[PDB]
Amino acid sequence: SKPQPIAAANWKCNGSQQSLSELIDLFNSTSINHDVQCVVASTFVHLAMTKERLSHPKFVIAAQNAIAKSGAFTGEVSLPILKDFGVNWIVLGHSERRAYYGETNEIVADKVAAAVASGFMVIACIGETLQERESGRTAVVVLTQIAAIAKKLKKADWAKVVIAYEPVWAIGTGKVATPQQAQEAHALIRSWVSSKIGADVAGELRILYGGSVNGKNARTLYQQRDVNGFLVGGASLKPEFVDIIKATQ
Amino acid sequence: SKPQPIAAANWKCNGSQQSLSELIDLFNSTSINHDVQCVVASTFVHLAMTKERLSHPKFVIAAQNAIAKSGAFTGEVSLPILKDFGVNWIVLGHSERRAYYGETNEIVADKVAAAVASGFMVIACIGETLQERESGRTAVVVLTQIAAIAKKLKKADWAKVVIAYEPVWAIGTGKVATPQQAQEAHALIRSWVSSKIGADVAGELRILYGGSVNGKNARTLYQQRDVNGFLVGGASLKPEFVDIIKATQ
Numbered sequence: 001s002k003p004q005p006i007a008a009a010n011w012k013c014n015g016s017q018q019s020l021s022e023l024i025d026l027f028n029s030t031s032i033n034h035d036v037q038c039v040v041a042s043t044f045v046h047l048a049m050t051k052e053r054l055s056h057p058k059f060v061i062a063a064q065n066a067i068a069k070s071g072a073f074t075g076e077v078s079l080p081i082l083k084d085f086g087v088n089w090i091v092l093g094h095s096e097r098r099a100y101y102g103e104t105n106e107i108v109a110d111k112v113a114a115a116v117a118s119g120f121m122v123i124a125c126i127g128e129t130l131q132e133r134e135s136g137r138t139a140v141v142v143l144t145q146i147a148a149i150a151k152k153l154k155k156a157d158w159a160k161v162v163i164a165y166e167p168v169w170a171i172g173t174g175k176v177a178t179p180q181q182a183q184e185a186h187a188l189i190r191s192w193v194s195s196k197i198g199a200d201v202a203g204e205l206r207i208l209y210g211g212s213v214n215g216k217n218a219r220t221l222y223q224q225r226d227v228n229g230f231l232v233g234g235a236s237l238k239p240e241f242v243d244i245i246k247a248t249q
Numbered sequence: 250s251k252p253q254p255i256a257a258a259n260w261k262c263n264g265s266q267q268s269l270s271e272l273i274d275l276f277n278s279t280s281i282n283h284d285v286q287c288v289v290a291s292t293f294v295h296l297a298m299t300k301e302r303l304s305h306p307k308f309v310i311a312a313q314n315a316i317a318k319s320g321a322f323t324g325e326v327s328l329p330i331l332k333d334f335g336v337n338w339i340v341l342g343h344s345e346r347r348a349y350y351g352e353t354n355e356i357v358a359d360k361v362a363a364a365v366a367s368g369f370m371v372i373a374c375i376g377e378t379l380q381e382r383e384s385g386r387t388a389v390v391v392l393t394q395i396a397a398i399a400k401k402l403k404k405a406d407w408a409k410v411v412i413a414y415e416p417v418w419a420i421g422t423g424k425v426a427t428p429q430q431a432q433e434a435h436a437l438i439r440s441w442v443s444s445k446i447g448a449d450v451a452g453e454l455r456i457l458y459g460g461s462v463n464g465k466n467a468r469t470l471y472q473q474r475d476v477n478g479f480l481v482g483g484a485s486l487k488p489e490f491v492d493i494i495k496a497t498q
């Protein structure tokens with residue numbers, strides 16, 4: 001027994017009006033009979049086109065990042081701005097933002113807190129690097145990442161939160177995550193929640209796998225106990241994402 | 250005898266569909282009988298709204314930031330994406346990005362170079378902090394900055410560049426540079442340009458002032474030799490921007 005799954009498409013910093021409009025069509029045509037929340041997270045530029053063109057009842061749109069308040073932050077986009085524009089999902093604390101854009105545990109937690117406060121559904125990413133892994137720090141890192149978020153939330157807040165575990169150690173490194181390793185990490189996060197926050201919260205919490213997923217391994221990953229879905233990279237700009245949605249059956 | 254001025258609205262991270270809509274209606278309604286290029290730089294999210302609603306022939310739209318290439322950069326917007334969307338102007342190296350989001354001279358230079366290569370019109374920002382101004386380091390700071398940019402450019406490229414001189418201490422503080430402070434900074438920039446690049450280039454380069462510019466003070470600022478217009482923050486959110494427009498030629 002699992003909560004509603006989520007299949008999330010992280011388009012990242014890609015796409016053209018053309019290529020996207022096509023994918024959108026594929027999507028809209030997709031026949032999905034189970035209870036799944038599908039999410040499409042496009043560039044800020046593409047939000048309006050994706051809003052207008054996505055008609056499928058199982059798909060919502062998300063942003064790939066935000067800042068808490070409006071004001072003098074040239075080039076950034078705020079939560080109020082996405083709210084007025086009608087976006088209600090958001091990806092926060094993606095590994096690429098932590099690696100290249102200054103996003104510390106604290107910054108992420110502040111973002112999560114504001115977003116929750118503002119009504120969003122949040123997909124909050126966490127996960128450890130090769131180095132952290134190699135030196136037996138998986139636990140230390142992951143739990144610290146989740147703890148920083150936790151300190152800022154109340155129990156009630158958890159209903160708006162999704163966690164996406166990213167095996168950063170296995171992205172761009174040469175390494176392979178097996179379904180077993182995915183699951184270890186997932187179980188560990190659940191334990192933390194269950195333990196620190198509640199069993200109720202824990203049983204209801206979606207923990208998405210944010211590693212390497214394609215249509216051929218998404219079922220075997222979903223087979224694992226603590227897998228509730230995926231945060232997809234590359235395969236999301238492809239038709240194969242349709243196989244990924246199906247794997248959450 | 251001055252090049253064509255520019256009045257640029259940098260709305261930064263602000264606004265609603267409705268409030269912006271009003272502005273736009275106001276703008277469209279404005280008769281501008283002199284040669285001036287108006288620029289509206291809105292959030293990524295609002296680019297669609299803007300490009301669809303702005304109809305005045307004297308106004309272009311710009312983005313407030315971008316990264317050079319498309320890829321795995323969650324939350325970021327690339328030049329190709331922008332270009333694909335029909336955006337041809339862009340604001341790069343704003344103090345806010347250098348201050349808060351880790352944008353170094355090298356980082357700004359790279360961005361500018363890439364943008365000039367992808368055919369955009371770039372408004373490259375430079376300016377000294379309070380600290381630096383007090384130390385008597387203004388000349389070093391400004392010229393270092395302009396130099397980093399110049400490194401990556403070829404002479405032809407300059408036709409696509411606009412330089413915005415925006416003393417950090419005047420950014421949304423009410424502390425406008427006096428017309429002498431402004432004119433001295435601008436002249437210093439130009440003299441670097443002629444010396445290093447060419448006199449022909451220099452006589453063509455638009456150098457804008459930015460910093461607590463408003464309807465009242467803009468006329469005097471504009472009278473100054475080396476002042477070719479403005480990068481306007483807070484007042485670009487009000488009808489007052491119109492007075493600003495009118496202040497040029």
Ligand SMILES: O=C(O)[C@H](CO)OP(=O)(O)O
Pocket residue numbers: 259415419420421422458459460461462480481482483484
């Ligand atoms: O774009 C900005 O930084 C503007 C002017 O450059 O700031 P202000 O709100 O002070 O006009």
